[PDB]
Chain A
Amino acid sequence: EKEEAIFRSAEMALVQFYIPQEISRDSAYTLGQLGLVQFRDLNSKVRAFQRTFVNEIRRLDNVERQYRYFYSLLKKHDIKLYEGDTDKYLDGSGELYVPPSGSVIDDYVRNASYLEERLIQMEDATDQIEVQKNDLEQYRFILQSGDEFFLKVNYVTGVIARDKVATLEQILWRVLRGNLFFKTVEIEQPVYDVKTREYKHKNAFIVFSHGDLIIKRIRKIAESLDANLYDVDSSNEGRSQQLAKVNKNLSDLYTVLKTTSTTLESELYAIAKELDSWFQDVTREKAIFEILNKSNYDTNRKILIAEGWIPRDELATLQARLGEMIARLGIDVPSIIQVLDTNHTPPTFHRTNKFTAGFQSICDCYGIAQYREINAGLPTIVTFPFMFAIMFGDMGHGFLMTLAALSLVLNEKKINKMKRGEIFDMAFTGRYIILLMGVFSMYTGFLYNDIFSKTMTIFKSGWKWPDHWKKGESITATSVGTYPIGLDWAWHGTENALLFSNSYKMKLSILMGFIHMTYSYFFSLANHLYFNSMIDIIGNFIPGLLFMQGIFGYLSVCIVYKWAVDWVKDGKPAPGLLNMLINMFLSPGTIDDELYPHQAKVQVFLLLMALVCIPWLLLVKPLHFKFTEDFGDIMIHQVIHTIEFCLNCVSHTASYLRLWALSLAHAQLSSVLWTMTIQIAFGFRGFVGVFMTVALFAMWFALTCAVLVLMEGTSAMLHSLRLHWVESMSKFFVGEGLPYEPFAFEYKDM
């Protein structure tokens, strides 16, 4: 049974293949069909041109260049490439398929070369015919111009690109000064330059001059620019005769071009029906020969030594498949699999699924986890959606996003089958991400009592407004209870509502961020335990843990305790926790209001603990290394880490206030949109009122889905990513791992 590799990377095994040469080409093909072995470069010191399989790779590169020329021709002429072979090789299933024979690859190479020469000569002939046709057509257009064109040899007539006609006119004016008679008429249909196969707008230009030297100078000036000059006799009868001659020439050239293009298109259609298969087959052969290029060819023997990383659970499968290959070949060979014990950084492999793949990609974008290190995707599966939800907190927007994600999830098969754009592909891949974000946003908005900027009144409020009051009279409510779930709806639209919401959400963000950083730090502890780094536990984990606790965990505990204490009933002032924390450093031992008994002594002790832990974290590990020039590197790294950690506690606690910031802003923008868009509709009645309601709700929903669901939603999704990449993964994620990219065959699109 394959181990689950989501909590930690899959256990990796290095394996030597002593691949016999006579079956090497086949062996690689199986190792590429499994898609499980990540081969090491044993010839890393060998130059690219000095490697053993360089010539075969060069042959395959030439074949792929010829195929890339064939594709270019298939795109120049509007001929569709016949895609296929997606299910021919059963890619990703791990099942073996008989590879192309060496004779088949030789035939592919020879046919590619032969088609290269044939297509080169056919394209040359077609291009010559096309340029002749373009020249004749331009000459015909010049001849067909009205006599007024030749009214004002005695002149130079030609065709020149519009982007050059102004330059030509300016140059001719300068050459002839004021004696310029440059006429130009636009050619409606652009001409195709075969040299670039580019559509260029052109003008028929005529310049009148009498001097033979002046005429020659004008012709040279025009031809220096990409202009084609033509001879015209200026006589209507003679011009018509020349036009008829050009028409006859074009009639012959049209048939010649038709025949040549018919042959060329026949060849291209023959190629198109099989080009994809040839490309897929040659790219796989080039791929197996690059893999073998990483092997050490024992010249004295006839075996290639290939070192590859494979998941240990997959190891047995590998052997089985190799055995199958032998059973297919019928040859008797020595042990082709030999597990190896070497101190080489194994690749990081996390076994994911359609659910965990999105979050694993989210965490991998930052970096690849160290081998068998605590994976940040498993905790992000929940923590990235919920930190977003805190930043979002609305049942309406959350429900809209949940439905948007459900549209992708329920139709996941159909969307997977079709092609997707980059933005749509990203949205679909993170479809479960967005589903969780929407669900948790609904939950948080329920706790915030925020649905489309409005509040729900499910439960009896804990506040009772005065029995009677007059219109406009400032009334204050009295606490008769506590709202069971979520924020009490009593302070909806109240003057002081914002003061309570801000306090609550600041404290919520602080507590949640501290809990999420403590969880990450204990993940770091788990990493230390797994790698048996007791020195990291003693000199890195415990000191930093004490430093962060004594300050910010103490702040969190004080927040909770202050919430749990009835100050008004107890007759004690409500201490300011921010001023308590500030005085805990700037003025130790001076407490304006006593939160709890012996507060001053405890605060002094915690400050002393942090001030002792800073030296602890800074010195214990480097000194342990010294006592057992590298000690210099250890000391420098420890100093940097300690400064970073001490500053990061504060900068990370302050940063998680972005949860409150974005939640508050989302709520305020939602309420403001409600007031601007749909609240006005309630002010108008009748047909006007109904139309205003319809239009204003249309605008409100458009701005809610656009601004408050996608725009604000994207922002909150990306501030959740930083709280994970910078505040969560800064605590335990060493990173700098080797991504697992096993040698596998995949359809390669041209």
Chain B
Amino acid sequence: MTELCPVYAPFFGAIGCASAIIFTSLGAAYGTAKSGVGICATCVLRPDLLFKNIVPVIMAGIIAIYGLVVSVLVCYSLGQKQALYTGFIQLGAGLSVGLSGLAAGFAIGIVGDAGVRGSSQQPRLFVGMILILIFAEVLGLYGLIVALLLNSRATQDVV
């Protein structure tokens, strides 16, 4: 165990690989669950909209995709003798993608539920929901991006 590379440095990166998927899958599950509740409430009256009110459940899954990407990138930078700086960077990259995806999912759900419930009455609202949902989704993206940037430094110029 080096000064710069303690034995516990891999702890943070492995918790970051986990945090990215666990929290982007919490947000995606919340979004999918609420959007599905809305879809089941609406499609009882309007089944024809079902294969088009699935969009929020598709966006929530994309949050989970953003943390399966940050997790897989952070897991391949994990090493037995990888620096504590790299471990902190990998923890930060998973904290960022995972938390941003949680927020984005929690919002995608609440907004998809509202928009599917209202679109069964006002079809023109579908465009409004998808636009409010693309801005809830971009939050998660912004986390991934930060996470990605973090990983671009995690292993580089590191002794």
Give the complex CA separation of A365 and B58 in angstroms: 24
Would you call A310 an interface residue if the criterion is a C-beta within 8 Å of the partner chain's C-beta atoms?
Answer: no
Give the complex CA separation of A668 and B147 in angstroms: 12
Q: Are B131 and A668 in contact, CB atoms less than 8 angstroms apart?
A: no
Q: Are A664 and B134 in contact, CB atoms less than 8 angstroms apart?
A: no
Chain B nearest CB, measured from A371 CB (Å)? 24
Residue of B nearest to A666 (CB): B141
Q: Are B131 and A718 in contact, CB atoms less than 8 angstroms apart?
A: yes
Q: Which of B51, B126, B134 contacts A719 (CB 8 A)?
A: B134
Chain A residues, Cβ within 8 Å of B66:
665
Would you call A423 an interface residue if the criterion is a C-beta within 8 Å of the partner chain's C-beta atoms?
Answer: yes
Chain A residues, Cβ within 8 Å of B130:
714, 718
Would you call B144 an interface residue if the criterion is a C-beta within 8 Å of the partner chain's C-beta atoms?
Answer: yes
Chain B nearest CB, measured from A663 CB (Å)? 10
Give the complex CA separation of A372 and B130 in angstroms: 31
Binary B-proximity of A698-739 (CB < 8 A = 1, otherwise 0): 000000000100010011001101100000000000000000
Chain B nearest CB, measured from A479 CB (Å)? 20
Chain A nearest CB, measured from B154 CB (Å)? 11
Would you call A577 an interface residue if the criterion is a C-beta within 8 Å of the partner chain's C-beta atoms?
Answer: no
Q: What are the 10 tightest A-B residue pairs by CB atom distance, in nearest-first order?
A: A718-B134, A498-B152, A672-B69, A423-B52, A661-B145, A665-B141, A715-B134, A668-B148, A495-B156, A711-B62
Would you call B7 an interface residue if the criterion is a C-beta within 8 Å of the partner chain's C-beta atoms?
Answer: no
Would you call B142 an interface residue if the criterion is a C-beta within 8 Å of the partner chain's C-beta atoms?
Answer: yes
Q: Count residues of A near B (Cβ-Cβ below 8 Å).
A: 26
Chain B nearest CB, measured from A177 CB (Å)? 40
Chain B residues, Cβ within 8 Å of A719:
134, 138
Q: Are A661 and B62 in contact, CB atoms less than 8 angstroms apart?
A: no
Q: Are A665 and B131 in contact, CB atoms less than 8 angstroms apart?
A: no
Chain A residues, Cβ within 8 Å of B152:
498-499, 502
A–B pairs, 11, beta carbons within 8 Å: A365-B127, A421-B52, A498-B149, A502-B152, A661-B142, A662-B141, A669-B65, A707-B62, A714-B134, A715-B141, A719-B134
Would you call A658 an interface residue if the criterion is a C-beta within 8 Å of the partner chain's C-beta atoms?
Answer: yes
Chain B residues, Cβ within 8 Å of A423:
51-52
Chain A residues, Cβ within 8 Å of B142:
661
Residue of B nearest to A725 (CB): B131
Give the complex CA separation of A658 and B139 in angstroms: 11
Chain B residues, Cβ within 8 Å of A499:
152
Would you call B33 an interface residue if the criterion is a C-beta within 8 Å of the partner chain's C-beta atoms?
Answer: no
Chain A residues, Cβ within 8 Å of B145:
661, 664-665
Would you call B114 an interface residue if the criterion is a C-beta within 8 Å of the partner chain's C-beta atoms?
Answer: no
Give the complex CA separation of A499 and B150 in angstroms: 11
Q: Are A668 and B69 in contact, CB atoms less than 8 angstroms apart?
A: yes
Binary A-proximity of B93-131 (CB < 8 A = 1, otherwise 0): 000000000000000000000000000000100110011
Chain A residues, Cβ within 8 Å of B51:
423
Chain A residues, Cβ within 8 Å of B58:
711
Q: Are A715 and B69 in contact, CB atoms less than 8 angstroms apart?
A: no
Chain A residues, Cβ within 8 Å of B135:
722
Q: Are A658 and B138 in contact, CB atoms less than 8 angstroms apart?
A: yes
Give the complex CA separation of A365 and B126 in angstroms: 12
| 491-522 of chain A: CB within 8 A of chain B | 495-496, 498-499, 502
Would you call A237 an interface residue if the criterion is a C-beta within 8 Å of the partner chain's C-beta atoms?
Answer: no
Give the complex CA separation of A664 and B148 in angstroms: 9
Chain B residues, Cβ within 8 Å of A665:
66, 141, 144-145, 148
Chain A nearest CB, measured from B25 CB (Å)? 16
Chain A nearest CB, measured from B127 CB (Å)? 7
Give the complex CA separation of A668 and B67 in angstroms: 12
Residue of B nearest to A668 (CB): B148
Chain A residues, Cβ within 8 Å of B123:
422
Residue of B nearest to A718 (CB): B134
Chain A residues, Cβ within 8 Å of B62:
707, 711
| 33-90 of chain B: CB within 8 A of chain A | 48-49, 51-52, 58-59, 62, 65-66, 69, 72-73
Please name 11 further chain A to chain B contacts, defined as beta carbons within 8 Å, in addition to the given A423-B52, A715-B134, sorted by A numbering.
Answer: A422-B52, A423-B51, A498-B152, A661-B141, A662-B141, A664-B148, A672-B72, A676-B72, A711-B59, A711-B62, A719-B138
